[PDB]
Amino acid sequence: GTPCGESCVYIPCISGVIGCSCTDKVCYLN
């Protein structure tokens, strides 16, 4: 729900491993 300030537009989310799921090219923390 809370954007992790990370996006998978060009490269995959690195911080996303903490739970951040890429929603519409932008990783959100549930």
Q: Would you give an account of this structure?
A:
It is a single chain. It contains no helices and three strands. By secondary structure, it is mostly beta strands. The protein has one domain (1-30). A three-stranded antiparallel β-sheet has the order 1-3-2, with no helix packed on it. The relative contact order is 0.40.
Summarize the SSE layout with pairings.
Elements: E1 2-7, E2 21-23, E3 26-29
Strand order of the largest sheet: 1-3-2
> Which series of helices and strands comes N to C?
EEE
Total beta strand runs: 3
Categorize the overall geometry.
globular
Number of helices: 0
N→C terminal distance: 4 Å
Rg: 7 Å
**Tally of individual domains:** 1
Indicate the proportion of strand residues.
Answer: 35-45%
Largest sheet: 3 strands, antiparallel
What share of residues is helical? under 10%
In terms of structural class, how would the helical and strand content be classed? mainly beta
Family: Belongs to the cyclotide family. Bracelet subfamily.
Cross-link (Cyclopeptide (Gly-Asn)): 1-30
Pfam families: Cyclotide
Keywords: Disulfide bond, Knottin, Plant defense
Quick recap of the structure?
This protein is mostly beta strands. Helix content is 0%, strand content 43%.
